[PDB]
Amino acid sequence: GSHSMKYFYTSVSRPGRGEPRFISVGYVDDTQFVRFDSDAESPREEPRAPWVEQEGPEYWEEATRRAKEAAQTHRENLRTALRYYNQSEAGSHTIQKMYGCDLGPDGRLLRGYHQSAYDGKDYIALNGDLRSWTAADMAAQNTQRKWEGNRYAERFRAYLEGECLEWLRRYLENGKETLQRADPPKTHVTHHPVSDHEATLRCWALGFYPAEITLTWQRDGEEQTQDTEFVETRPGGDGTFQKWGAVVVPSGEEQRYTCHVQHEGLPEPLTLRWEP
């Protein structure tokens, strides 16, 4: 039911401290499976998921090769950027690049991604049509023009519909019981008095996958945004995710508030009340 594979690239220049640091990670949906760090004691593509370890040496050698090539080219892009924005070589700068493909249920390509930022701001991104590019500024227009000149969008499109999908399906089959799972969130409501006239209601959602989830509070059956605090979805450290949503309530109205939780692993959405 719609899956995704994405690669994340981060190159940071560090003047005086040698070559720029290169860190790239691979994800299937919300599960990391590979990792390459130029500052590792023996830089190479490493497995971070149990279901990818079964790949033979050829896979790790090829992956290491591609990762290293990406590192070199990124290092060249740093310099090219210094020249574009007319910046000093004594300052630190960062290039980030995410790309990947979305496997639709019909087995065909659903979505394509190839976007990159410089110093935390959009630089250049592949458009939804997977044929044209969008440049964020003047400097990126050079990259856009020269990428159009050598038909890169098409070349990346060949990968999107080729190796990307094939290997995505492969990963999906090999890690079926962990990637194609829908673990529902363990939920409960807690009560934390703020004073004598108020109290915080906290709705918990623990150990669910994937990270996609929805938590809302309602007063008398009507959604409430006032006096609510929803924290950013956080990882469990074991491959799961957590999230809680709190609401400040007048003492005595606790039973008029309900928590609503929507998740893929839930047969039907949950309506929770504080059970002392």
């Binding site: 690669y7 591609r66 070199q72 080219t73 060249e76 574009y84 990307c164």
Partner: peptide, 9 residues
């Protein structure tokens, strides 16, 4: 699997 070619800016 990673993308073979890397585009230069």
């Amino acid at each position: 699997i990673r993308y073979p070619k890397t585009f230069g800016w």
